[PDB]
Ligand binder design. Sequence first.
Ligand SMILES: *CC(=O)N1CCN(CC#C)CC1
Ligand SMILES: *CC(=O)N1CCN(CC#C)CC1
Lengths: 304, 304
Amino acid sequence: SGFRKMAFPSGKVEGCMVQVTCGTTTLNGLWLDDVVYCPRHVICTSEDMLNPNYEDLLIRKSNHNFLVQAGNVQLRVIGHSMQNCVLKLKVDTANPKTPKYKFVRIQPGQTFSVLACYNGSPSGVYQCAMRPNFTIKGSFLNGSCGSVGFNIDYDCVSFCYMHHMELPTGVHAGTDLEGNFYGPFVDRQTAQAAGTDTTITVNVLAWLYAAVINGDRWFLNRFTTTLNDFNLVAMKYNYEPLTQDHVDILGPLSAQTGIAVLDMCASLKELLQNGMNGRTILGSALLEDEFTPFDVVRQCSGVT
Amino acid sequence: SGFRKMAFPSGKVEGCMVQVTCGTTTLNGLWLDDVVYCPRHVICTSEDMLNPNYEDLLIRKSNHNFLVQAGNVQLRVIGHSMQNCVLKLKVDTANPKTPKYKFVRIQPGQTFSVLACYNGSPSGVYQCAMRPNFTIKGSFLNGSCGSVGFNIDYDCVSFCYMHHMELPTGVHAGTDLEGNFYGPFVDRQTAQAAGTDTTITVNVLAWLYAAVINGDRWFLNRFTTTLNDFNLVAMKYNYEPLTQDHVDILGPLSAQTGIAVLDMCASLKELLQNGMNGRTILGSALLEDEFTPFDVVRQCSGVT
Ligand SMILES: *CC(=O)N1CCN(CC#C)CC1
Ligand SMILES: *CC(=O)N1CCN(CC#C)CC1
């Protein structure tokens, strides 16, 4: 028993991290097969970031300008291309440590592990959620760009995120592995509005089920609600509206615990209206939304 | 910027995990050089755990009874010995993936990463603290025993913990890599009192410094305190008494932020007496004690 914000084992991704330098800018890259993927702003100076013309900046660069180092050995660059906001540097050597992988574009509310890196070296790993407004609340310093987000299903790594920037508000923005930003963000040092964020309702209910499974039950009440009634409360507290698709995904947790999804919604409703009254749930004093129903099932069943 | 409960990259430890089976019991082992380390209760049946005589149970076992599998390949056991609560199975092959390592016994209040494993396979990684009462609040199901806790300094892995059991209260107990339990715990299925736990005061202040560095400053006040005055409040709220050694370890954070340690203590004092008033600090609604001053410095400087 016990419930933790658990990240995927980072080994398979550590073996893919490389350092990419272009001019005086050093970022992280992801080496899979004979391609190194990195944020295209590796070609910018700090001055260029204010209003970069990536096409014009990249034309001044040749294969030999991209210095790619994997640990202590240098990779030879034989091609470069820009795809959206990522650069793909073709190297002459396939990464011997390339795991089975896929590039996937995750949905808002889905979770993933981030391997924070600097100079191609891993510093740490943490679990986070893609916010409904397509930002992530990470831990990233200058040099972390190119660090990636991923999920793992047995032996296959699904890369979903590449870090590109910190908004002036301190939250983080990035792309899928095809270089498409999540959200309305552009790789430019300008003020950028992130949407109004909301709480991931389905994740909070999944976490409430994890709490019941692991012994924390004080919040269970004698009430029930309807999807319509619950959603009026969800709107007032800036929670995402719950749909039948969300109820269906909670089905296994509802079946395991014997607590109907709408009864769990009534518990959530009372917690939103009354607060925790100084109590905690799974060591937290707020309603946690960074665990999907799939995460709760996996952690509660010990999936390796 | 941003601050997360970050674990060490688990790659170096993943390469050491093996499955150990003895009779009908399967646990995880740690393969370093030509030795596999695992909890000695791998020799017990569920019945034996009530009151095991490990010496007598181990005498009925030969090298061929310990089935050690690393991924898909079987290791040949050529020796077995019990050291405190761990078994050391000498194998005929040195682990090719053995990182630079040390066995260290950590102090209460210190933090470490746990690589939760089942059947020798890694499921996830999370950061936790050794409680002042020598328990850990982990996430461990049956089969997770033998999973290990560790810290990493550049290329050296310092193994500090091996998981052995869940107390009836749902908290976790284990040993150092020499098989010595942290705390008064015994590897027996009996009711065992964990001491009164306390909050790791030095870690809370370190986290308050991390909050100031990362922008959360609402809790800073116009007050100061003394070590004596602060400790009277710490005693009332079951916080560990702050010593000059703790103040000294906070020195770098106090120097970086310009906030004297006793002024941060006065902020902590007001937070203990008044609560958060519905506000949050670094996305938390309670005072976090799972970040040491060293963790805050490392995460805030991007140590790889
Ligand atoms: C994204 C990142 O890590 N940064 C470091 C380099 N800065 C200047 C350039 C290019 C941008 C932020
Ligand atoms: C420690 C662990 O993972 N357990 C699974 C096996 N149980 C019976 C035995 C031996 C003990 C708990």
